[model samples]
Target: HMMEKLKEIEKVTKAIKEKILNHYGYIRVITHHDTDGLSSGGILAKMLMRTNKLFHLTVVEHLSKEVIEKLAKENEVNKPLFIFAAMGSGQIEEIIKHNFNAIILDHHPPVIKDSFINENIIQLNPHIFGVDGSREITASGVCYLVAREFGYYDLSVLAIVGIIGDMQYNPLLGLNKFIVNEAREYRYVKIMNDIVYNIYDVEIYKAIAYCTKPYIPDLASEGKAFKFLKDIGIDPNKKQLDDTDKKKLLSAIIFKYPKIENLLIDRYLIEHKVRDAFLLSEMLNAVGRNGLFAVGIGICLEDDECIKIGNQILWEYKKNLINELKSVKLKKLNNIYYFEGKKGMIGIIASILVDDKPVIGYHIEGDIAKFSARGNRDLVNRGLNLSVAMAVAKEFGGNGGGHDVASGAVVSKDKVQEFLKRVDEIIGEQL
Candidate 1:
């Protein structure tokens, strides 16, 4: 059975090679809209370009049946090779039902039910290979493997991007050490703080613009929303600014955020410290929930119009996201903070509430309950992993996993209140 899966990967990789070598003419790269997805798409795009093939990159918020149908018509004539690099949890199953050649690289649990071993399909996911979900390997890592196999050795930088975006460093316990060593040896990626990576402010901003919803919160402390810009000398208010200015500035900031030495690190610090986890959660989740794919694709293309519209949407969504975050009422039951949100908003809502403090967020959708927990980051050094707490949820017919401080899970809705009570007891004992 394992060999069967490996065979699938080989099949898909060979297909990509054949398509590229044969000059498929028009290739389509479709992935998720999140940082991880975008990073993965970037790697694939970079690799494709190196191969001298023409490709179009697109990002989707979530892979749903509706999107599958829409794409059926859009790329019908192009004879596109659908690359699903979304969350890797079955985003491509629906699309697979249709007649299409697909190469899927993902890391999320397979959330869809379908046979993935078709002739034209290739799926590379660690979960299928028995790697722990909490491990450092991610969709980008999977895609990187494909690139390496295909001789796209230079694109490993993008895999690092996806790993950093998903916070996979936690599970690896700094496993990127090898990557750091290689980057230094090859002089491809710069290494500092034991992490071999670079952040391009432009790409980060483009991602922000694309995923921005209809709210623009005064995210900057002191009510200065553009502090990020002013600190970097980009004043959105001053100029009769065009998309080029916005994107150029955005790219500069995004690329600067990851490196501690980068001046733009202050903006990330402010967001991490001041913005409620729920608020940040809403901003990222809104794009997926609301289906803002075009914006995501535009960001990948670095399209000026798309980036401008995305920035406007980001501003609007930031405002609305703050209001929505504030509206959530926290209740104490057995001393665990529990809040109920609309069915669809549960996971996003719960994740947003996670902070440096010890807290639990609960979201209910239909018959399932989802939870995200937050604790002191220092607790990890003491051997704390929320995956242990997830084990507690498992007893109640739920499944969840995460880092030492921030973890999550899903259980039967009817058992949620009971599960919450038990989880609080467990946390009290463990903490």
Candidate 2:
């Protein structure tokens, strides 16, 4: 079943390229404002870079008709070609409704839309092509398909990063054996153990628990994040120089051993034999939530100055994030509960909160709300994809999507309360 899907996706990539090379002009790369989106965008950007093509780039938390209109206005000339990285759930379809020529590379449950049939848009989603969007592969995986066709093989690493960012490694066995086997044919793909963990070189766990928000804070006095680490019995002095030991020490503090969520979750974290997969996902997410997304992407692109700046911001925010999470107060309404923290910490908190129960988190900024939904591991095994939550959010004017164990979304502040209520009801029904 999987091979057949992969084959179909292969054809979809071939078609997407034929369409783009044939008619599109100056590219407009628009992706979600998250780790997965950033990773996917990285892959797309690498493709453009290799082709010696410069394109306008925009990253958003969600897609709305209003946003589309604004983007259309901004891209009035140069024959716009949209490279959408938002996972399915019909956002791409909505964009395709506009007259702009486009291609959508995504992996999420699809919400059927008539606009998808339009010739001006070529969608390379796992849904229409029969691939599993929530599997080890992801939208970035699809992006890789396109990148490969364009002979931009180096970008495949970015796609892998996207898959990791999306947590595709845990449940669906991270990179499926097929992709792993094939990717091995290319020397750039290296599957090493969690030899040097420490949370993918970012120390994201400490960042979250510290309430870090990226960039140096204006506050003249910093909090005692290190003190909190000591309070939790994590001796920084004994910290391993290698990333792996650092992660093991960190994981011992954060995640509960013998995690009892989904079968895939346990296998992905333990049996799949990869090091620090979840930790890596968290680190990538921190960069996006903390306003270091561009910097993170630059680092991924091999820009030294950007990497140094990004790391500095990462460390500072990580400290603050830890201090902040210590004070988080969980609020309950109807059937759901949540608490705000540094934006960069929401995804980690949401995932950790729901290990044995159902919960979600939102990182609010002005008029927008970035959400992360958590679920019982056993419940996830029963096959629940929170794309349904995203769908409800969309119906009520929000944007988001993901699998059952964990998912994410964005909503307007005015509608956030309403959106949460509706989502609680939807999730209740699913459970």
Candidate 3:
């Protein structure tokens, strides 16, 4: 099933390239404001830049009617081929309604209701092709297909960054296995045994304390991490690190939290200076989650200064997340958990907390309430489709949808609780 689909995608990407070269003059990339989204736009932008194609890129949270109309004006005058990077699958109606010359490269499941027969719109989504998008591939992976079709093989590193950003290993089983093999065959990526984050980014003890990936319970506290590392007879002030130290560090961490060993095996980007795939994904997430998406594009473009900026942004981002995790109040419904917090950090927070139960992170701005949900495959397997549960908010005069593992909703402030109740009841029934 997977091999057959992979070949079809190759043909589709080939056709897309032919169409762009034959007819399009300028390219306009519209992507979301997340790591995966930014990677898609970055990879596409770099690919086009290499080919000497004139292009413009915009990062947006949603494909609203107003935004699509603005692009429609440019489409009429510039005749740019609009590329919706990892974003337009859920907004096909908006894209089609605007009648822009465009192609959608998204992994999100399609929300198509209208016919797209003669509209000159091409969509390459894994879900529509009967593949599990969440585990099989990501948006940047989809965009990489186009890049590979053009023979620009170096961008494979950025695609892996997006895959990591979306937290998709799947072991890929075989789908992403092909991309990784291609990457290694070209010597663009290397799998190595190492820690998750850059210990060099901060004081070694703080690095351990702030480590949230494996969520080491015992060493997560500042004092605890400091004491534990001190017992290892390592001075935090001296920035000298040896291979044996890292081995002991991983050994200690895994001895306490077995999960750390799973993340110890990381991939390095031979071309991207950000090297560590997990670190690069976190940097992109921090910058984009803080609403500096343009900076994210630069980071993926392998800018030294941008990498430094990303590192600084990451410090503050982690501090804020740690503070929130320590102080935020959470409530549990029968089937899920919920919290109110800043909208920008909801995805990360909810994702961290959502192990088997779906978690909704929310905050209100003026008269509207915005929130997102994060879930895991275990809950999905048991019976939970977050996007479907989130749809009930639309009855309150709002909009929402996403994949089974992650989803969101936006509605009037007055109905926030009401819709949340509906979602809980729906989830209750779903489970």
- Give the number of the best model, judged by lDDT: 3
Q: For candidate 1, give the lDDT.
A: 0.54
- Candidate 2 to truth, TM: 0.76
Using all chains and alpha carbons, the TM-scores for the candidates as numbered come to 0.53, 0.76, 0.93
Please, what are the lDDT tens digits per residue for candidate 2 over residues 361-413?
A: 77778878778877655766664557666557776566676765567788787
Cα RMSD of all models vs. native, in order, equals 10.4, 6.4, 2.4
lDDT of each: 0.54, 0.60, 0.80
Among these predictions, the greatest TM-score belongs to: 3
- Cα lDDT, model 3, residue 6: 84
Whichever of 2 and 3 has more lDDT, that candidate is: 3
| Minimal lDDT window, size 10, model 3 | 111-120
Question: Which digits, one per residue and each the tens of the lDDT, describe model 1 over residues 1-431?
Answer: 43444565565567556655665656777787655676577667767777786777767645645667887786567667767784435445565667667766766555443325577665665565554334546666667766766666555555555555565543343223344344445544553321011121222232232222212233322234355555666553442234555455546644754322222221111112112222222233344344665554444344666555555565565445455566778777553466766533444445455433356666666777767665545445554566576667768866666445556777898887787777777766665
* Tens-place lDDT digits, model 3, residues 355-380: 66889988898998888988888888
Q: Give residue 169's lDDT in candidate 2 (0 to 100).
A: 57
Mark the 10 consecutive residues where model 1 has the least summed lDDT: 266-275
